[PDB]
Structure formats: C-alpha cells, structure tokens
C-alpha cells in the first residue's frame, strides 16, 4: 500500500490538468493526499524555489533537465532506485534518459521533449519563406527576445563551438572564445538592423495582435498558438542562418522537462512522492498533458501514437532533436552562472553595448566565468 501526504508544484496554467492527472492517480492510490499548487516562481526557478527552504518546498516539483546537476550535487534530489531507473529507461526515448542522468545516475522522472520551432501565420509567410532566416525576415516580421539566452545561445553551436565539451560534461570544455564565437556575436549584431526582426519581451502577444508573422517558441505554447492562429496555424523547424558567409542550420536547445522528488521527504511521504512522480510522468499522464498543452511526450509508445504522430508540432520537434539541429541542454552545476552570463553576452552583441572590437575579450571573459 502507498500512504502519505505530498505537495506537487507545477506551472500556473498547468494546474487544471494536473488536478485531472492527480484524480487518476488517486483512483489507483486512494490513500495519498496530494495538494497541487503552482510553484512560487515557475518551473524556470525550481532549483531556487526548492533550495531556499527544502522542508517547505513541494515534495514533487517540475524542473527542466539543465537544473539537475546543481540540485544533485547540493543534495536536494536523490538518485532514482534501480527499479525506477529501469522503468524510465525502458519507457522513454533515449534522449529523455540522457537528460535526467548525471554522472551515471538518474535524478528525475522525464515527461516532455522540448525544442523550439518557428510558429507562423501561413497567410503571411509560405513554407518556403521560413526555410532561411534572411528570407523569412525579408518577407515578414519575426518577434523574439535577444535578452533570453535560451532563445539565442544555440547560435554559438551553429557556429561550431561546444558548450561544456563534446557531451556537455566537461567543465573547461566551452570553446566560444574563438573566431567561431565571434561569428555568432556578429550574427546577433546584424539582427539589430534587420527590419524583419522585432525585439519584444512577449513574442506570443505580438503574434496574437498580428504585428508579427512568426515567432520562435516551444511546445508549452503549441495549443495556445493553434488557438491564436486557427486555420492559419503553421509550424516549421528552425531555418538556416548565414555565419561567415555559409548557410548552417540555426540550432535550438533540446530540453527535457521532468518531475523530481525533494530529498527532504522521508518514510511514507517519500514513498508517496516517488509513486506520484512516476505516475504523473507515465504514458497516460503524458498524453493528458499533450491533449491540453500540446507538449510532446517522451514516452516511446505515446510518441508513435496516431494522435501525436500526426501533429505537425511533434514532427517539427522530432526534426529539431536530430543531431545538427539542436543540442541537449547541459546540466553542469555551473549552469546558473552560464545562464546569468550568457544573456548579457548575447544581448550586448545585439544592441551594440558590446562592439565588434570587444567580441574576443568578452568571449574570453565569458569562458573564464562559466568554467569555475
Ligand atoms: O520568461 C518566462 C519565465 O519568466 C518567469 O521566470 C523568472 C524566474 O522566476 C527567475 O528565476 C528568472 O529565471 C532564470 C532562472 O532562474 C535560471 O535558472 C535561468 O533559467 C534557464 C532555465 O533553467 C532553463 O531550463 C531554460 O528555461 C527554458 C525552459 O527549459 C523551458 O521549459 C521554458 O520554460 C517555461 C517555464 O517552465 C515556465 O515557468 C515559464 O517561465 C516563466 C516563469 O514561470 C516566470 O516566473 O515559461 C517558460 C517558457 O516561456 O522556457 C525556458 C526559457 O525561457 O533557460 C532559462 C534561461 O532563459 O535563467 C532564467 C532567466 O535569467 O527569471 C525569469 C524571468 O525572466
């Protein structure tokens, strides 16, 4: 039997359908009392919302894969048991297992495969127009945010640099302090004068108002964007960009969204938390998330289901996941410093706060900063 009381943290707009998933959980585990709330500062802040006060934080909480190495090293999450690991590995696609694995051990329960794509109004741009960045932006406005390093750091990967080495595990392996890194900086700077590129803190709202023909966004907004665009909805994988005169695919990050179990819980509450985390990341639950938000399951069976297999967003995400089209977000403990420093590096190049004469210096400083 499973008994106990557990608190579950999800994002604000996910609460209604996680209550449905928890109702399904309670059909099987009637004696577990679950309280579902939104998290204090959203899934993007999980490591900080938990770490501020582990005993007060949720027992099961939503967290993206990049945060897991920090939380594992800090002791906030324990490794999954051998049986739990076996189930994650058997049930989900390989990149989901890689996403939750730190130094050979799994630390979370994966549920969604995330890659940004182009979402666009097909009455304003054609499928051919969206194949190249310059061609798209010559024909319509793409709204985006150069202050968000998740959006734009992968241009450095398109440029041929590595982030924490070959597989994202090498502390000193970021090599953007190079001519290749400068090519990416120059690309950001070029976009400031591209009249088809609109800087905004809310690209989705510019799509909704009709001021943008296209945005870069992820599958957490798939259903939202389908509603906004209606019969004009279209999606495509990321386009090519020109770096040093060559056309190369513009990358996105590949992220894996997960639930983790707070290591504070003990006794029956710990068992209940692990059971809940397994359940809410199972195939049925992933498909409920898909039905509501359009997020893409990591479950092998769910991905091949007719419903997901026919969704154009799923197809674009599966393209994005291929080598060369994205890179899995690393999960080094240094990732907080990486994100903090990457955003001003990129935005400084875009706005001109960092002029070309400073690219090499700033990239050298960046590598030192993120490699401690
Ligand atoms: O912008 C939307 C976001 O805004 C608000 O969050 C605050 C947040 O509370 C602050 O802590 C801070 O965020 C920091 C993070 O703390 C820091 O870790 C880092 O974040 C990086 C993430 O760790 C990394 O995973 C990735 O984030 C992706 C993520 O993988 C995607 O799943 C997707 O996340 C969605 C979130 O799950 C969701 O909560 C919401 O996020 C809000 C948040 O709720 C709100 O309170 O929507 C997003 C999708 O739009 O996308 C994110 C990328 O945006 O990359 C980030 C780095 O970009 O750095 C951030 C920023 O410095 O600040 C934000 C407000 O800016």
Residue nearest to atom 10 of ligand 1 (CA): 45
Residue 64: name the closest of 15, 108, 14 by CA: 108
Whether 168 and 246 map to the same domain: the answer is yes
- Backbone torsion region of residue 310, taken as left when φ is above 0, otherwise alpha when ψ lies between -120 and 50, otherwise beta: alpha
CB atoms within 10 A of CB 242: 15
Tokens of 136: 């798209």
CA of 146 to the centre of ligand 1 (A): 14
Domain, as residue range, for 84? 1-115+253-330
- Is 262's C-beta closer than 6 angstroms to any atom of ligand 1? no
- Count of all residues that appear for the chain in the document: 372
- Backbone torsion region of residue 246, taken as left when φ is above 0, otherwise alpha when ψ lies between -120 and 50, otherwise beta: beta
Whether 168 and 238 map to the same domain: the answer is yes
- Is 146's C-beta closer than 6 angstroms to any atom of ligand 1? no
Whether 314 and 341 map to the same domain: the answer is no
Which resolution, in Å, applies to this structure?
1.0
Tokens of 291: 């039905």
- Backbone torsion region of residue 104, taken as left when φ is above 0, otherwise alpha when ψ lies between -120 and 50, otherwise beta: left
Residue 164 has phi, psi (to 5 degrees) of 60, 40
| Measured distance CA(361)–CA(366) in Å, rounded | 9
Tokens of 122: 């097909």
| Measured distance CA(186)–CA(127) in Å, rounded | 27
Distance of alpha carbon 12 from the chain centroid: 17
| Measured distance CA(140)–CA(197) in Å, rounded | 9
Whether 326 and 244 map to the same domain: the answer is no
Whether 110 and 130 map to the same domain: the answer is no
Whether 240 and 260 map to the same domain: the answer is no
Whether 209 and 341 map to the same domain: the answer is yes
Whether 89 and 203 map to the same domain: the answer is no
Tokens of 33: 């009392």
CA of 225 to the centre of ligand 1 (A): 19
Whether 261 and 209 map to the same domain: the answer is no
Q: Spell 164-174 as b/e; 16+ CB within 10 A means b.
A: beeebebeebb
Q: How many domains does the chain have?
A: 2
Contact (Cβ atoms closer than 8 angstroms) between residue 312 and residue 52: no
Tokens of 233: 């909805």
Q: From start to end of 122-205, where are the E strands?
A: 142-144, 197-199
Atom number in ligand 1 closest to CA 257: 32
Whether 359 and 213 map to the same domain: the answer is yes
Top mutation candidate among 11, 44, 224, 296 for ligand 1, by most atoms within 8 Å of CB? 44
| Measured distance CA(297)–CA(317) in Å, rounded | 11
| Measured distance CA(357)–CA(27) in Å, rounded | 63
Residue identified by tokens 């024909």 is 139
Atom number in ligand 1 closest to CA 114: 32
CA of 45 to the centre of ligand 1 (A): 7
Whether 218 and 355 map to the same domain: the answer is yes
Whether 161 and 202 map to the same domain: the answer is yes
- Backbone torsion region of residue 235, taken as left when φ is above 0, otherwise alpha when ψ lies between -120 and 50, otherwise beta: beta
| Measured distance CA(30)–CA(175) in Å, rounded | 53
Q: How was this structure determined?
A: X-ray
- Is 204's C-beta closer than 6 angstroms to any atom of ligand 1? no
């Amino acid at each position: 039997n499973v008994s106990g009381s557990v608190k579950l943290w999800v994002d604000t707009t996910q609460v209604p359908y996680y209550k449905k998933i928890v109702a399904n959980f309670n059909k099987k585990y009637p004696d577990v009392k679950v309280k579902v709330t939104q998290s204090p500062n959203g899934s993007a802040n999980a490591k900080t919302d938990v770490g501020k006060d582990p005993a007060k934080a949720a027992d099961v909480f939503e967290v993206a894969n990049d945060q897991l190495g920090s939380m594992a090293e800090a002791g906030y999450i324990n490794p999954l048991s051998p049986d739990a690991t076996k189930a994650v590995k058997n049930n989900n696609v390989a990149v989901a297992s890689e996403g939750v694995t730190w130094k050979g051990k799994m630390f979370a329960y994966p549920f969604a495969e995330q890659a940004q794509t182009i979402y666009y109004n097909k009455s304003k741009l054609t499928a051919d127009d969206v194949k190249t960045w310059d061609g798209l932006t010559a024909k319509g406005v793409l709204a985006t945010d150069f202050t968000n390093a998740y959006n734009f750091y992968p241009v450095f990967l398109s440029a041929g640099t590595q982030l924490y080495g070959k597989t994202g595990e090498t502390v000193k392996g970021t090599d953007v302090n190079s001519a290749k890194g400068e090519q990416a900086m120059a690309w950001f700077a070029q976009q400031k004068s591209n009249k088809g590129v609109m800087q905004t803190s809310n690209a989705l709202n510019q799509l909704k108002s009709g001021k943008a023909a296209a945005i870069l966004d992820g599958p957490w907004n798939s259903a939202n964007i389908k509603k906004i665009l209606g019969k004009n909805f279209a999606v495509a994988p990321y386009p090519t960009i020109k770096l040093d005169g060559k056309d190369v695919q513009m990358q996105a990050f590949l992220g894996i969204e997960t639930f983790a179990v707070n290591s504070h819980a003990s006794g029956s509450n710990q068992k209940a938390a692990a059971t809940l985390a397994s359940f809410i990341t199972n195939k049925e639950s992933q498909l409920i998330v898909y039905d509501h938000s359009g997020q893409i399951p990591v479950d092998k069976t769910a991905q091949k289901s007719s419903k997901v297999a026919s969704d154009p967003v799923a197809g674009a995400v599966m393209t994005m996941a291929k080598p060369g089209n994205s890179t899995l977000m690393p999960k080094m403990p240094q990732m907080a410093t990486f994100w903090n420093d990457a955003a001003p590096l990129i935005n400084g190049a875009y706005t001109g706060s960092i002029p070309a004469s400073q690219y090499s210096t700033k990239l050298d400083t960046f590598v030192k900063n993120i490699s401690k």
